[PDB]
Structures are given as C-alpha cells and as structure tokens.
Write an enzyme that holds these catalytic residues in place. Structure first.
Site, PDB file in Angstrom:
ATOM      1  N   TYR A  60       0.835  -1.193   0.000  1.00 27.41           N
ATOM      2  CA  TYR A  60       0.000   0.000   0.000  1.00 27.41           C
ATOM      3  C   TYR A  60       0.869   1.242   0.000  1.00 27.41           C
ATOM      4  O   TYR A  60       1.602   1.502   0.959  1.00 27.41           O
ATOM      5  CB  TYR A  60      -0.969  -0.055   1.189  1.00 27.41           C
ATOM      6  CG  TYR A  60      -1.758  -1.358   1.148  1.00 27.41           C
ATOM      7  CD1 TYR A  60      -2.823  -1.513   0.251  1.00 27.41           C
ATOM      8  CD2 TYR A  60      -1.378  -2.463   1.928  1.00 27.41           C
ATOM      9  CE1 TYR A  60      -3.515  -2.711   0.151  1.00 27.41           C
ATOM     10  CE2 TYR A  60      -2.068  -3.679   1.843  1.00 27.41           C
ATOM     11  CZ  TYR A  60      -3.143  -3.790   0.957  1.00 27.41           C
ATOM     12  OH  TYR A  60      -3.844  -4.963   0.847  1.00 27.41           O
ATOM     13  N   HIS A  73      -1.510  -0.174  11.084  1.00 27.98           N
ATOM     14  CA  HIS A  73      -0.527   0.896  10.856  1.00 27.98           C
ATOM     15  C   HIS A  73      -1.216   2.232  10.565  1.00 27.98           C
ATOM     16  O   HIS A  73      -0.818   2.950   9.643  1.00 27.98           O
ATOM     17  CB  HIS A  73       0.422   0.515   9.692  1.00 27.98           C
ATOM     18  CG  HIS A  73       1.821   1.041   9.844  1.00 27.98           C
ATOM     19  ND1 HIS A  73       2.198   2.297   9.421  1.00 27.98           N
ATOM     20  CD2 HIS A  73       2.934   0.474  10.368  1.00 27.98           C
ATOM     21  CE1 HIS A  73       3.481   2.480   9.672  1.00 27.98           C
ATOM     22  NE2 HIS A  73       3.951   1.392  10.255  1.00 27.98           N
TER      23      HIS A  73
HETATM   24 CL   LIG Z   1      -4.089   0.506  -2.593  1.00 27.10          CL
HETATM   25 MG   LIG Z   2       3.471  -1.566  14.046  1.00 30.64          MG
END
Ligand SMILES: [Cl-]
Ligand SMILES: [Mg+2]
Ligand SMILES: [Cl-]
Ligand SMILES: [Cl-]
Ligand SMILES: [Cl-]
Ligand SMILES: [Cl-]
Ligand SMILES: [Cl-]
Ligand SMILES: [Cl-]
Ligand SMILES: [Cl-]
Ligand SMILES: [Cl-]
Ligand SMILES: [Cl-]
Ligand SMILES: [Mg+2]
Ligand SMILES: [Mg+2]
Ligand SMILES: [Mg+2]
Lengths: 399, 399, 399, 399
Positions: free
Chosen positions: D157, D207
C-alpha cells in the site's frame, strides 16, 4: 362540535409606545376572531413577511379546532425550522387559535388547560439607577405600588469608548467594562440589604455580560445577599459552564429568554442547571410548545418565570398570565406597566394589583386589537445600538 | 492595505430552473463586488426582507476587511439570533465579504485559508427509481459519468392516503409507511451489491423518516452492505438516540443538513456520535462559522460532507468546493448538476469531472451574477407539499 | 495565481541579548522571502540540525502556496511526531509560509485570517522582587508605562540548599521550599490589594512548583484577592487534578505553555478545566495548528493567552499579535520588552502602547531579519541551572 | 559501594544493514562502560546533536549509580520535554547507566529487576506478500523456523497515483486506497485460516491506515478469524474512538509504538481500551519509565508487546528481552532477524530459538559496540518516501 374554518390570517406591526409590536389576527368563517403575539421587536418586518407570504396561504381553509396538528404541521413546513422568526410567526397563529378555542368553549384560556393552581401569580418589575440614590428612588416607587419582588440594576453599561481606557481609534458600539459591572453589582446588593433589609425579594439580570469564570465569581460574591434569582449569568452557548457555577454557589439561577430551539434547554433542564426557566413564549413557538416545556420543567423541579418585557403585545402579557395561573410550577410574572395608548390598542390585558396578577375572566385570551387605532401608530425603524456591545479592547460581546 | 468601505448590500431572488435561489451582492466604494448565498428555498421573501430592511442599513459605511468583527456583530445584532432566516441573511453578507477579500488578495478563496489539502474532492450525486430497474438505469448513468460514490433511493414516499391502509376522512398531506420504506431500503442495498459488487460507494438518505428504534433497527439491517454513509437517520431533536445506534451498528453516520444553531451539533460531535457532518453552510451563518465548525470536527475525528442540494446558488456550490479543497478533514462533495440557465445567471461555478471537483483558479469565490438574466427569472411561489409528511394514521412526521 | 516554488530553507541561531533565538528563512524562486520562529531556547542546535538536515531537503522544489498540505506532510514525515524539537522545526517553516502568503496577498497576516475582532489586544508584563518594597517599585514602573495587567512574583525560588533545612551532602541544584513559596504568594496578593486596590488586574505564575493538594489549597487561598489568572498551577502530567481545583475555587486558571502534543490539551479543554490556554505557538507546530486550537477553545468558551516570553524571536511576538487581533476569543498578550539590538536584528515587531498592542500594518508577519547583524551575535551555550529544581529533601520537581 | 563517576558520553550513528541506528556510550572513571539505544531512524543526526551538545556537558562528573535522580533530572532539563528526539537522547543514556549497574552487580539486567517470571518470551516475526502465494511462502518459511506467532500482511500500500483512480495532476507521495486495504485484509485472514487452520497465532498491523468508522468496521470483519492482535487500528489522536471499536468487537487490540508522551497512554490504559501496549522503549525515555509503564499496565490487566522493528540497535532488542523475561505481564517479543554485519557491530544480542527468546546470561545488557567496525558503516541519508502517505484524492494520511 363542528369544523371552525380559517378565513384569513393577518399580521400588523404597531408602535403605540416605545416598541414595535407584532400581532397576528386569525378570522374564521364562523366569525370567531383570535389574536396572537408574534413580537420579535428587532426584526418585525420579516415576521410580517412570514405570516403574509407563507402562513396565510398555507393555513386558509383549515380546521382551527385542531391546534395540535396545525402546530406540528406549521413547525416543520419549511423543512428547516426553529429560530426567532420562524417561531414568532407560528406563535402568533398558535396563540390566535387557542384564543378561538377559549371563545368557542366560553372559558378563559387557563380554564381550558384545567383551571387554577393558585389564587394569583406574584409579579416583579424593573428598578434601575446610575447612582444608589436614583436606584433607591426607583425601588421606593415600586415598593409603594406594593411589589414584594424587584429586579435591581445599578449603573448603566454601554456608552462611548472615551468613558474607559479604550484603544486609539475605537470602533463604534456600546462599550463597557465587565469588572466595573461586577463590582457595582456586588456593592448594589450590599447597599440594598443595608437599606431595605432581608424580606424584600431582589432579582438581578446579568444579561450575558460575562465570561464563564466571571459568572462563577459573581455567583459566589452575590450569594451572601440571598437573591431571588440571578438571571442570564451566561450566554446560551456557554450554558455547560453552569455546572461550575453550581459547584461554587447556591444562588438561584434563571435562564432562557434567548431560547428558540429545544437543543438550548434540554440538557440544562435535565441536569438541573437552572432553577427558573425564562423563555419568551412567542420565541419558542407559542402556547402549544410552552405547555409541553412547562411539563418537562415540572418533572425536574424547575419553576417558570416566562419573559415579560415591554417588547411584547398585551396579548402576550395575557398569555403569560393564563399559563401562570394554571401551571403548578409557575413562580413569578415579570411585568412592565403599559401606556394608556398601548391599552387602547390592545384592551383587556391583566394589571398588577399589590404585587399580584389575578385570573382573567373573559373567554379566550381576553385581549382585543383595535385595528383603526393600530393604524395611528405605524412601524418605526430603530437602530437598537445596545446590541453592538463592546468590551474595553473593542471585542463584540453577547449583548 | 486600506479600508474597503461597503457602499450597498442587495438581495435578489431568482429561479432560473426549479428552485428559488437567494443571492446577496455587496458593493464597495473601491468598486470590488462580492456575491454570497442566502438560499433558504422555502422562505426566500423573508430572507430578502432581512437583508433589505435590516442588514443593509446596519452595514453600509463599514470596513469590509474585518470579516470577523462584522460576522460577530451581525450575529448578535437582533439580540435573538441563530435559526434558518437569520443565519442565511448573515451568510449572504459573510460570503460576499470573503469574495471581496480573495479579489483584493488576487487569490482563490481556498488559498486565503492556507491553500490545498488534496488534489480534488470526491463527489457524489443522487440516483433514484420507483423500481429496481429504474434505480439501476439511474445508477448506470452516474457510473458512466465517472461517479464512484452514488446516493441511492428505491421507491418514493409521500402520496395519497388511499395508497395505504389509512383512516376514513384522511387529512391532506404526503402519506407514507415507515415499514415499507425500511424494507424497500434493505432490499435495495442487497440488490445493488448483487448487481454492482462491493467497490461502489453507496450512500443512503433516511431523511428523518423514522422513530428512534426504527433507526436503530435499520442501521443494523444495512450494516452487512457496507454503506459509505447513512444520513439523517434521526431528526435533530432525537439525536441523543444516536448513542443507541452506535451501540448496535458500525454503519457510518452522517447528520446535520438541518442545523442552524450550535446547540444542535455540540454534544453530537463531542461524543463522536457522527462520522460526517452535513451542515448547509448558509444555514450556519456562512464561511466564518463553517471554518470554526470544521476545526471543531477535526479535533474529534469527524469528517465533512457539507449539504449540496439543487436549492443553493452556484456561489454556494463554489464555497463548498473552496472549503473542501482546503480543509484537511473534508470527505466528499454532494453535487447536483445545473441547467444552462442556472450557469448563465451564476457563471464560473465548479464542475464535476470523473467523480472529482478540482481547485478553483479565479480570485475570490469565482462565481458571478448576471443581474439582467436574474431579473428575467423571478421568484415563483411553491407549495412544497412534501413537507406535510404524514404516517399511516395521519400523524405529522419530521419531513 | 501561480505556484510559488521553495528555493531554500535556512536556520539561524542568534543571541542579540540574553536568549538563544532560532529563526527559519524560506526563500522562493519568485524572490518572496518568509521568516518564522523556531525558538526552543534550551536546545537550539538540535532545532537547527532538524531544519538543515531534514526539512530543507524534504521541502525544496515544493509549492509554498499550499500551507495546509505542507503542514500535514511535514507533521507526519518522520513517522514519529509531536514534541518540542519536531514542532519548533515545522513552526519555523509554517510561519515563513504564512509570511509569504501575506506578502503575495499584500495583506497583514491577520487580514488573511479574516481581519480584526478587536481594536487592540490588552497586554501584560512581568513584575518581581525579593521584598515587597522591590516588588512595589517594579509594579509602579509598569503602571507608569500604562499597564493595567501585571504578572507579579514575590521572592525568588531556587538557590543553594544551605538556605533551607536541607540534608547533609545535598545534591547540586536550584533548591526551594513549596511552603515558603505558597505563603509568600498569599502574602503578596494581600499586600498588593492593600496598596493598589481592586481594579488592577494581577496575574501570578505558579510555574508548576506544587504538588496536587498544594495547588488546590493555594487556589482557595488566593480566591479572595480576585487574580486575573493563576497560571500553571499543576504540571501537564497532573492536569486531571484540575477537577479538584475547580471543585474548591473560582480562580481563573491558565495552562499550557509546556504543551507540544494534542493529547495534553484535548481533555482539559473538553472538560472546561481551564479558562485561558497558554500555548507557545512554535511549540505546537506554528500558525496552522494554532488556528485550529483557537477554534477548538472557542467551542468550549476557553480564551487565549499565548506564551510570550523573552525566549522567542520578535517574529514570534508579531505572530502572537496577528493571532490576537483576529481571533475572537483572544484575551491578552504577555509582552516582554526587547533591547535595541534585538529590534535591530528583527525589525518591525509590535510595541505595547499604554497596555495595548495594535493591528500590524505591513504585509505578511511584518518582521525582517538582518542576517549580518545576526551573524555578529552567535549562539552561546547556557547551563539554565534553574531547570534542576529540587525540593528541601533533594527531590527533582517539575521546574 | 562507591560513586561511579561519568567520564564521557558519546553518540554514534551506524548503518550496518538497512537502517540508521543510534547508540549512546557512557564511559566512567572506574572503567565500566555502558551502551544504550537512542534509535529514531528518521532523524538520527538530531539525536546525536542532543547527546553531543547537551547531555554530554550536563552529565559528565555525575554519579551513575543514581539512575532514578539522573532520569528525573534529564527529563525536565530543557524545561519543555517529552517527544521522540528528547526521549531518544535520554533513553540512550538511561539504558547505558542500567548496563553499568548490571555490570557492577555482576547480574544480567533482568536479574536486577527481580529475576524471571517466565522461562522464555514467545516471539513473532513479519510475513508479507503482494499475492496469497507469496504471503503463504513467507508464512511457510517462518513456520519452518518454529514460529507459532506470525504477523501477516497481504498486498502493498503506497505507490504511484496512476495505480488507482486519482485526480489529474496528482501530488507526489505514496498513494493507497483504504477500501482495497480493508477488503484484502479480510480476504487474507479467511485464506490464512483455510490454509493453516486455527492454532496458528495470526497478528495484523493496520498501521493507522484508517478513519475511525473504518477501524470499527474492520475490527468487526476480522473477529471471526480470531486474531492474536490487531495493531494500531487508529492513530494516537483518534484513540478515544477505541471506545466504539470495543462496543462492536472482541478482537484483541494493540497500540502505542508511536507514543512519546504519557498523555498518549494514560486514558487508554485506565479505560482498558487496549489489550497490549506497543511502546518503543527508547521513544518513552528508556528502561526507567518503561518499568513504571509496565506496572501501570499490570494494575489494569494490560499486557506488554514492546516495539521491536529492524530500526533498533541490538542493544534495544536485548533491553526488550530483559524487560520481557522479568515483567509478569509481558506477552510477546516482536523480532526481526539481523544480518551478520549487524551482529558484528553489536555482539551478544538475543536470538530466537523455535519461537522463544531465552533469558540473557551476561552481566548488564550483554551487548557490545565495536566502534572500529561501526566506522565502516556511516550514516546514510534516506528519503523514507512511505511517510508521505496519500489517500485516493491526494489527502495526507497518518502513515
Ligand atoms: Cl491501494
Ligand atoms: Mg506496528
Ligand atoms: Cl429564524
Ligand atoms: Cl462600564
Ligand atoms: Cl427532580
Ligand atoms: Cl478523536
Ligand atoms: Cl454542473
Ligand atoms: Cl461552552
Ligand atoms: Cl519592545
Ligand atoms: Cl522532540
Ligand atoms: Cl483490571
Ligand atoms: Mg432578562
Ligand atoms: Mg439529506
Ligand atoms: Mg508561565
């Protein structure tokens, strides 16, 4: 009982004395005429626009008997709702329909509600003076009239910037000093108790002049003098700060003349942050919602002190009275005396007799509207320069 | 930089297409003209009365540079304040003043605020149909236009009472059945996922059709279909019940197009009871308060989806965009296409390109006002019969 | 308007007087230069390392117009974020970028924000003395200068352990006695009211000297003397105890010069635990976040008193002023006079006139940077021995 | 026992493999040398500035025995405090002093604390792949090494804007689609359970990729797959939203690698909004505060999973291990294997054996620092382009 069909709805602005007053007249096919208050004195022409251009065409031909449906329908009719103008327009009509119902029943309004819960409502009026000598004379005159409750102010707040230590090139407005107001107010209560003793009920209107900590402080400072209430200690947008005022002081608190949205009162009442509610009946949409609000207040032990300024038709004064005679939790009626001319335009409104206002006796509201005489007193534009309230650095404050 | 002195303030009502639109024009001695949106489509004449009779005489001669002081002053000027009419009047002036400041700076409005937070704002538009086939055709068209976010409705709600099991002698209004609405909406989401799959962002506007438990139930029923948001699941006066919706469902919740008083949004934001705020910028008093609200939302992780219906001038569309390009927490722009005539009256407003609206490039708002074409399209009275929303027993419901 | 491309970013440390000051200079391809404050006086070399080694290579080539995107990007750029060094580095750049935007617009910074909320901001400055006679002379001087707000301290706290009942073999540090500090402060307020009366606004900085109960006690003891505020009554990590201070006292409370993480201020604002916020603008990441914070404060009725010590460039002084002239909830500007040399290095910063600071008139921040004079006054290492604050048993206390 | 006098404090940046690592060396007059971790990989040169220019001159000549006073003193020494840089500098020194104390005692660090509360700490490591086939191979390799706990990610990503439906002229950054990330993650857990069954402990790091409702939604969607924890589901500034995540899902929640201010963890722990705390020991100021934090966590039933990335010296890895062997509420050690070169520069750090890390046996931390070899691997500037994380409209998101 048969349908009572609305024939027309009219709106008049009349200024018999000092204030632009707004009246709604509802006429019916049956010939029963009702009158209501829609007085928002600072924006009267817009109230009239709403009635003439919107509520009139909406309402003609409907059955006036069904006040509740009509109220609910009018309330949501523009989709967006609440607010001083929307609510005042609806109030005029709502009050007028209750007036019609009273006449059809042959009963004073408060008798429709279920009758008396007291023999008379106590009243208070306004005393003021720039100096103690002037204030004392003002109080003395009200005591001689038989008032036992008096709202007192010492000093006047909001004049030229040169009267304080203002900045160079000050912006025009009504300038004042919160510190001066606060210390004068404390001195006022002390001097009032020294002169008049401890039985006189003394009220005082802070009129949202203060910041939150200032309100907390003033509440603590006035506690020794046992005020009947301290009114509008904070502006509505800072009402959460009443929690801190409550933590620090037992002074009775009154709030709400400014309210025109239920979001403004709900959490206040539910958390018992006030002792008296102060709503202006026409600002909250008339009798229909005032009855529900009064009952909500009752369930939380809050008492009623509806707003009763000079900027209200005698129809509105009468409506306060009907509500005050009926509702068990009513406390006191703010009352400002009326001129001969005002009484001539709106005959039949209650009078104060030795600090009391008595049950009205005529069917409906009991206040008429002399249209011909209303013509002799048209709307006059006023600047209301006091609403441009500025602090010593020139900051706009809630007026 | 020198004082920019207000010469006049005008209000125009124009209907180039379907909706009565209201625009405020502020002219200056320096010759810099600003335009603002004051569109409250259901009560436009009253907005005009406010601007022509009250704000014009208040404002002429003042320095336009000081938008903040002028906003604060106008806001409290009638003492009573807030509400749809009062706020729209002030919005018109506030936006025009920001328009003036952009022109004076030689910068698009959003550059004044501190410039871009994104390259373009995503947009959604409205799809509807009384059958799935009709809804699908409508959705297909918006997908062909490049929209990735589509607000979908199945069925229409509010017609003759004879279509339902209604009582004898039903009162006129727009009658509907909440159970029918609910089950059709659930059916709709299921059918849309079967047809289009799971990438399409699907929005749905409940439009305050439900009682509190119904809202709770519907939120749970719609959860499996992963809506982008579910909007106005409850009317403002029952927003406390969002606590129960939150306990029962993870659907994203949007609310607030109806707001015109800070008491309506404060507790809902502070308690994280919504994911997107939906305020109509002119309903909350213009750009000045919308910036502060956007920042209050930011502190609580609430995102922005300002109201963007057809009942708003293209000036208003443009202002949504400026705000959307600047504010870091902006999410999406509701967008309704405009006719040629609408664009001719108000030239320069943003256009959607493949589901995005891009940063405006001209100084100020970037939208003009063709007065002569405006006068060719005057106000038309409209009954707005859908606001008389009735349940199957005849009860008025929030529309 | 066209892209304004960052050419370079420089950081300078200069000590024209007593404090190591840090300034960021952003130059553009278009030749418009901006200056910002990054002053963290105790760790200036580290701020410089951040700007020279990290933010310069990150930022060159980017479009300066988009302050919001650049602020958001810089803020998260090291993944880990917040804190005094990281925030001061970003502040320097953020302020310089706003400086650039004002120049490009031809407007003073506060005019970009939407212009004035007041005609001038009140100012306070610092009075101190080890005896009342010394304190009085210091107060008299500031009153002669036209100050109506004065921050007063009696005694000095932090010297040799042999001045107290200290243990044998005491560890070196700045030793003091909380009981002595408390009783001297109470004595001070009493003596100042006896000498100067009750109109003088008297401020006092506790500077986190106390444990929680001591803060509660001192707040109650100081209440009768009506302080304008009592500042930093508790260190950030014990701010929850403000709930107890509120339960016991109506004194106004100021806090936050130490803040450099939003987690420090969020709950304290939301629970109305302070009356004034005291943040050092550069400590919280510059103008961009200070605007959002000011607006978050506004929603809760919290007022602004940004930190204004001698350890801040005149650029920083100017930015406090721009913010103070614009933001409606600004209260007061802490002001410390500057030497001729300081003014020579950073020309154009605001001056206090009879207790007021007035709107700046030049475009942007309005403060320059004489590089050659700056290089003549290089960084000097300082031990700052007062930060090693010890109680009578040798314990480190928050300084 | 006699004073152990600090002779020098040095800071080295070394890049033996992929990350810039920061080490602090404390030497003593007695010849006992300690080493500590101060690794903030994204801003290493500023950490070195702090140690060399500030902590060195502050600390030389002091008695190293008294870690607690020295920690407290260093913590408040710049007045302003907390933050990634300040805390990392102090951590290096604090760890080094604990290392010295261990050596002087002839005991492994964890034996100073009071010895073992387990025979070994479980470990997890990282598995990833763009496709399931690649992810499966990664998981298969860790299972063959004897891991029973594996942190799994499917997809990558943050790449070019042309890979999604981005706006025209996109701003450079690491672009991604939260919807794609969410659906890939759900699919990943389903496919992992299908392939590997239900005994394998599967962890997943969000995250801070999501908005609050997205986190709520994802938590509910992953619940059926029984994750060992779901990490960083929200960014620290939106941690209050964990209340809603808790209302909707029973997934174990881990948070805190980003923390460097106690205001970030306090309300989280006290309201039991997490199951595992994730703090990076050097980000919170070293062993001294980590011990107190671990105990605070214990009183509320929160378990420990300190951050153990590749961007940490093997000294830091060893410190995690000492803490993990001693503290009763320790759960798991994140572990990333090290290169030969990394082990050569920092010999003695713990290794994983069949999913377990065992008690260290040498006195103190048990990790050396080969200075000569550290020279062969100097600091290298890296852009860390992943921290410029952009959403599909180009908005910066917390990375
Ligand atoms: Cl993406
Ligand atoms: Mg982490
Ligand atoms: Cl209104
Ligand atoms: Cl005054
Ligand atoms: Cl009760
Ligand atoms: Cl939040
Ligand atoms: Cl269009
Ligand atoms: Cl508030
Ligand atoms: Cl000066
Ligand atoms: Cl830092
Ligand atoms: Cl527990
Ligand atoms: Mg009043
Ligand atoms: Mg809607
Ligand atoms: Mg201070």
């Amino acid at each position: 009982m048969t349908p009572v069909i609305i024939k027309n709805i009219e709106c008049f602005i009349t200024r018999p004395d000092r204030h632009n007053l707004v009246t709604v007249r509802v006429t019916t096919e049956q010939g029963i005429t009702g009158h209501g208050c829609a007085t928002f004195q600072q924006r009267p022409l817009a109230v009239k626009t709403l009635v003439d251009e919107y509520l009139q065409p909406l309402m003609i031909g409907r059955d006036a008997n069904n006040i509740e449906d009509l109220w609910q329908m009018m309330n949501v009719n523009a989709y967006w709702r609440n607010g001083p103008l929307m609510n005042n327009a609806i109030s005029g009509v709502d009050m007028a329909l209750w007036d019609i119902k009273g006449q059809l029943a042959g009963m004073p309004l408060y008798q429709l509600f279920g009758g008396k819960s007291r023999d008379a409502i106590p009243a208070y009026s306004h005393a003021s003076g720039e100096t103690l000598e002037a204030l004392f004379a003002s109080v003395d005159a009200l005591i001689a009239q038989g008032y036992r409750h008096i709202r007192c102010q010492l000093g006047f707040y909001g004049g030229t910037p040169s009267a304080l230590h203002a900045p160079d090139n000050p912006t025009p407005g009504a300038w004042f000093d919160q510190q001066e107001y606060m210390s004068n107010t404390v001195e006022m209560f002390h001097a009032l108790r020294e002169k008049y003793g401890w039985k006189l009920h003394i009220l005082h209107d802070v009129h949202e002049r203060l910041f939150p900590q200032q309100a907390v402080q003033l509440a603590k400072q006035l506690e020794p003098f046992q005020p009947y209430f301290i009114e509008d200690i904070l502006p509505p947008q800072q009402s959460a700060w009443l929690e801190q005022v409550r933590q620090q002081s037992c002074v009775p608190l009154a709030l709400g003349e400014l309210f025109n949205n239920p979001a403004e009162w709900h959490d206040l009442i539910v958390n018992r942050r006030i002792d008296f509610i102060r709503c202006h009946v026409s600002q909250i949409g008339g009798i229909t919602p005032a009855l529900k609000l009064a009952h909500l207040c009752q369930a939380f032990g809050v008492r009623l002190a509806w707003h009763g300024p000079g900027d209200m038709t005698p129809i509105g004064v009468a409506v306060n009275t009907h509500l005050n005679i009926h509702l068990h939790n009513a406390a006191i009626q703010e009352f400002i005396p009326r001129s001969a001319t005002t009484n001539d335009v709106f005959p039949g409104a209650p009078e104060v007799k030795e600090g009391f206002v008595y049950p009205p006796v005529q069917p409906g509201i009991g206040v008429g509207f002399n249209e011909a005489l209303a013509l002799a007193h048209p709307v006059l534009y006023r600047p209301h320069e006091w609403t441009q309230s500025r602090l010593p650095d020139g900051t706009i404050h809630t007026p």
